Design a protein around this ligand. Structure first.
Ligand SMILES: Cc1cn([C@H]2C[C@H](O)[C@@H](COP(=O)(O)OP(=O)(O)OP(=O)(O)O)O2)c(=O)[nH]c1=O
Ligand SMILES: Cc1cn([C@H]2C[C@H](O)[C@@H](COP(=O)(O)OP(=O)(O)OP(=O)(O)O)O2)c(=O)[nH]c1=O
Ligand SMILES: Cc1cn([C@H]2C[C@H](O)[C@@H](COP(=O)(O)OP(=O)(O)OP(=O)(O)O)O2)c(=O)[nH]c1=O
Ligand SMILES: [Zn+2]
Ligand SMILES: [Zn+2]
Ligand SMILES: [Zn+2]
Lengths: 517, 514, 513
């Protein structure tokens, strides 16, 4: 049971807990004195939209920044590198495994909000499976892709949605029109129930007769559904936890670079004692997934309750362990593939020979999504020739690429997809070698001159999407020419067929974290 | 804890008998705030602070209880219940009877010493420690007692807690708004859905709910009143504020639902392995619910005013289908009242090898042992009836067997016993293997022996109802000889007079009769 | 820390230390000239076995005997009675309390090697707790190292001795005696200032190749034929000219009280104590064990393999179960399979029992113990018509075991018995209702078919029944023993009686005293 994991974590981590009521209340007073609550109200309106854009994201990020400026309980950017010492060698293997698993769960929980899930012309079963994923993660339109956030840089969504007890307190007070004191009291009572049990709707009902301010709490919302400006029971419980000058609440834990390793060691002791685990399914976190994510985000702050909105990066980026895709990876890849329209015109192109590919790309011009990844060659002799005369890739730059993607991506391609390419024999052979004989191919056969008419235009617009081509490439007359990229080739070949290049933002299908290791 | 597991299982099984009584408890607490003299509440708290209380004190208590009972609608009323086969099986009733007998013994050894008392004077270090241990377990001239009273049965059911009274006292005597106490106790009730609240929980609750600092966590269910603020009292009241959670506290019992409730308790018992402990002191959840329900087939066993209920649980609920181990513990404990060093008379009626009435009397503290035995020699008995005791043999059927051996076994080591016989007493004590007891033969003349005979019967007639037959001497009719009255009159003869004095029965008048 | 305690003991006992290097080398030279080191190799092979039997034990005890025959540094059987004198009355109370605590720690450490611990079908939480204990002490479904008829033959068979360690290194490491001597001397030097650790040993091996024969991973589940760091350090302590090494202490009956008095001065000064943790001995538990084994010998370094008895039996103080005994009892109970068929039977009434037995026939273990009666009048009837126990023979039995054993019985056991009503009441008395009972109800006649075969095999298991017992008809009959009953009631249900070694769950010195 989840509360048992929590109580044992409380028992084990008691020495890292503190009484922070005063500081949370002072932060709440600073917001009350300093924050535009009509702008809070404005951000609540934006979170009620089914579809949000960069203008919506800017409003949220600016408000988060204004909140951050007024409070003292703030997390600071602190990369942590975990080495043998307080943590054992086996401790470190356990932690690196569990963080790989959390990376998978978090990406599959958050990414489709921005990447999107195609929900148009699909079979009954596909629609059912997809709906199940969407429902599980708390998730229109065009076309027919379901996507909550349409933004140029999805990375600007990181860490912008956490609840903070001082904000929750200031907003209950100001937006609910009660005295700060009555707000503190209602939360204290919820805090007290939480010493003994997770509070439920029935418990909260009884509390609302005492404190009508608790009527603002929606018991149907989860942390998947909310921002720091919304009133979930989760937000209220976390605030109430902070009001006790008393009892080992995990929400009051502070981490510093001096206590990180020990706090993690204590978590691993409870992990082994209770058999806690990271789940393979996306959506809501268990107590262990939650504590581990919060601690690893920053070795300097209050993991549960400080303002975390100025923190860049993910927890698996901010805390690293120092001494064929996995199941976790394959699930990420499968769900990322759901963004593709199986019916749409889809280009494919490769660099390297089809029995030895080093760069592969697929491109759907209509929605603008692309698949793009790399493979280390087997035949280094032939690679060197292809490097001089085609692709200009330095082999040593491929060392950091994720192995196994060629198989895995090709296996995950929609059944009966139709692929368009420039030179059909190479593609067929590659697809057949990976066991896909069902994919139909359209060979375009453009002339060499017609093929590269939009070459300069494509590289002018889209250069930032590929940095792999570093070597000078020549052609026999020898003259220097622009290197061939699988991805740019899909885009220029499509532009040549279409008779023009549009200025479109493109959407990467694979996470960068999967393309490279 | 195993105990809270027992409570939670009972809550599940019994949920259909629970009810939403928030509004009634609060309305009752409202009638008390409007109606009750809270200076008298305060007066009764003063009296509960005394180490020694008397009948005047018990008076104030019962009268204030009557005042409380007159103001509230949540009241249990007198309802005797007889359990017969039906909803409860043959096997069920055996279990409940075995369990009530266990509870009875436990409860008496817990409560009776508060008024009967325990001698703590001139005893060995071993005995003093063993007695101190018992005393600590139960909340407590050589005798330590708390209630010095004429009729101790007037203590029954005068000390329960009740949600409405606790709420009304918190409010008035704490000087906070009613809603404030409700709020604080609600919180306490919420915690009690998940655990039994402890001192730590109370500490954290008080920091925001100052009203709770009136609860002193040292005070216990045992030796405290409905007017005092124990954690138990607050927890019970909070249980009533939720209107949910299947709180045992909100159960109502009627003559129609009694057998069904006890059947569900028995179900939980078999499933959890619940039991009545033979240890005195704090009640486990099984012992406690069993007590509370069997007190009345009509009320709210946990939270109603019960102070108008006469009788005890094993008297108001009965199963219709020598000493047991449970009684021998009760017996061995009741005997602790005696001062081994005091002057002690012993007299018997019937010959030494066939006793029918035995008595011992310690004139200094006024306590007495008195019981009966069925004769083996019916021939010699009828002669004894005509010439000595006038006891009708059939009136002895109703007396408890095996007291002769158990009492003589439990008599304190090295006691000096005074008697108008010595020889019949010796033989009998030797018969039971008590050679260590020293005897003083007083050898009074026939006529000096019975100088105070009328005086003694005049004052103490109600203490023995067993002598019914006409007794003659060579013939003229004479006053029958009673073992108890003889001890008293022989003592008066030696003393040169008889004091007007209340005596104390060492044995429960409930162990003498079956 | 333990080295702190060692340092203080060295300061205070220094007058009892002597230089014994010459005698140690002489003994090692006697072994080198006399001992069969192929047989030493054979006993090392036997100690590598995870499970060992009585043939293995005989090999060890015969080799130990051969060693003992060859050396002059040997301890002699010498019982010590401690009386008021050099030790004060309070000294004697401290020492009595400590020997009781040490007895508990020692039994909890060594006894499971032979009694066994059940590690079969149990919860996750039980297996974790039991694994922790087994790891602490250096250790079908029952894990045991020694499967032997008489585990007392294990006593004093595993001590390290400097002459043997020195002889074995020399011969089996194929170096000159002087090379081993100088190597251990250097180790002894380090020991004047610290307990040598792995880095110290690693450093020394680079100048002394012989020292790589030593393992750094203890004194538990090894012998004197093993090359532990402990044995090598002990040998090294003997190689030094002075420096107050506890290893060189000699005790006699004249010095014994004075040595103990001095230890107690250190105990008081440092706050030394006997731990309740099973496993490795701290220096106070160690010196007290070694001194109290014999009042005549070299407690750390002599051959001890001919001494019978334990330290709390060989040294005694003449002046309801303790915490230490309850710890011992809880651990003893780990031997039982909670899932196995288990008989129970009692003599005396359930309210007043005087003999209790439980028996698991598959594994062969039995719980068996006594209690003094409350009602002597009923007891005397039971003595004449059932059990034949003389009440004065119950005086010497350990009280408090009824409550303690029953409270300690595995959760959810199923118990088989002949007549269920008395067992129920007794179990109910200690609030054990989780224990399910099976009433086997054999006829009186079928009951006791195997009565004579059981007594013929197992008489030595109960000596309590001395009274003549009779059955009205009046004729003499065989007294009824709770233990023998479980055994014969089992044989009747099984249709035969196997010849089977039985194992007592409880230590004998827990049943008595
Ligand atoms: C991008 C986005 C995420 N979310 C949700 C999904 C993210 O996984 C989640 C991250 O929240 P945090 O994990 O940032 O929120 P929290 O720390 O308060 O969580 P908890 O209550 O356990 O302490 O926010 C939204 O509700 N709306 C959005 O638009
Ligand atoms: C004789 C005497 C009895 N008693 C009481 C102690 C107990 O309150 C009472 C027995 O309990 P009730 O069952 O009388 O008390 P309760 O129902 O409130 O207990 P709980 O909180 O568990 O519901 O006998 C005294 O307090 N003082 C006395 O002097
Ligand atoms: C029963 C049994 C005991 N033992 C032994 C291991 C230890 O050597 C022995 C304890 O012996 P001593 O206590 O006899 O050991 P020691 O004096 O050599 O050790 P040290 O001076 O370094 O503290 O218990 C086994 O090894 N296996 C067994 O099966
Ligand atoms: Zn490229
Ligand atoms: Zn009479
Ligand atoms: Zn026997």
């Amino acid at each position: 049971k989840s509360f048992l994991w929590t109580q044992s974590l409380r028992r084990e981590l008691s020495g890292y807990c503190s009484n922070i009521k005063l500081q949370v209340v002072k932060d709440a007073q600073a917001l009350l004195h300093g924050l535009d609550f009509s702008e809070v109200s404005n951000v609540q309106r934006l979170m009620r939209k089914e579809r949000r854009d960069d203008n919506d994201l800017k409003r949220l990020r600016d408000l988060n920044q204004a909140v951050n400026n007024l409070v003292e309980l703030k997390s600071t950017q602190q990369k942590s590198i975990l080495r043998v010492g307080t943590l054992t060698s086996d401790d470190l293997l356990i932690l690196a495994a569990d963080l790989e698993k959390l990376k998978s769960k978090v990406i599959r929980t958050e990414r489709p909000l921005s990447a999107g899930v195609y929900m148009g012309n699909l079979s009954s079963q596909q629609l059912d499976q997809r709906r199940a994923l969407l429902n599980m993660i708390g998730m229109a339109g065009r076309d027919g892709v379901v996507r909550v956030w349409d933004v140029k840089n999805a990375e600007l969504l990181n860490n912008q949605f956490g609840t903070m007890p001082s904000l929750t307190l200031a907003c209950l007070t100001k937006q609910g029109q009660v005295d700060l004191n009555d707000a503190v009291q209602a939360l204290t009572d919820l805090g007290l129930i939480y010493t003994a049990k997770y509070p439920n709707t029935s418990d909260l009902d009884r509390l609302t007769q005492s404190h009508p301010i608790l009527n603002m709490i929606d018991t149907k919302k989860s942390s998947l559904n909310i921002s720091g400006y919304n009133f979930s029971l989760g937000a209220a419980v976390k605030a109430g936890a902070c009001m006790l000058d008393g009892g080992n609440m995990l929400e009051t834990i502070k981490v510093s670079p001096q206590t990180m390793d020990g706090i993690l060691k204590s978590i691993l002791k409870v992990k082994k004692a209770l058999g806690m685990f990271i789940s393979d399914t996306p959506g809501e976190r268990n107590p262990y997934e939650n504590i581990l994510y919060k601690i690893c985000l920053s070795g300097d702050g209050w993991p549960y309750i400080a303002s975390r909105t100025s923190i860049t990066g993910r927890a698996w980026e901010n805390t690293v362990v120092d001494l064929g895709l996995t199941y976790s990876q394959l699930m990420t890849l499968k769900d990322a593939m759901l963004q593709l329209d199986p019916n749409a015109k889809t280009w494919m192109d490769i660099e390297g020979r089809p029995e030895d590919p080093v760069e592969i790309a697929l491109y759907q011009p209509s929605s603008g999504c692309y698949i793009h990844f790399f493979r280390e060659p087997t035949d280094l002799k032939q690679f060197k020739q292809d490097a001089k005369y085609s692709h200009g890739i330095d082999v040593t730059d491929l060392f950091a690429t994720q192995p196994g993607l060629t198989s895995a991506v090709i296996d995950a391609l929609p059944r009966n997809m139709v692929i368009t390419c420039q030179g059909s024999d190479d593609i067929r052979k590659l697809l057949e070698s990976q066991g896909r004989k069902d994919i139909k191919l359209i060979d375009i056969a453009l002339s060499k001159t017609d093929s590269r008419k939009y070459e300069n235009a494509v590289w002018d617009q889209y250069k930032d999407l590929c940095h792999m081509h570093t070597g000078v490439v020549v052609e026999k007359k020898k003259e220097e020419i622009t290197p061939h990229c699988a991805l740019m080739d899909c885009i220029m070949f499509d532009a040549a067929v279409s008779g023009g290049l549009n200025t479109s933002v493109l959407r990467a299908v694979l996470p960068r974290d999967m393309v490279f290791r």
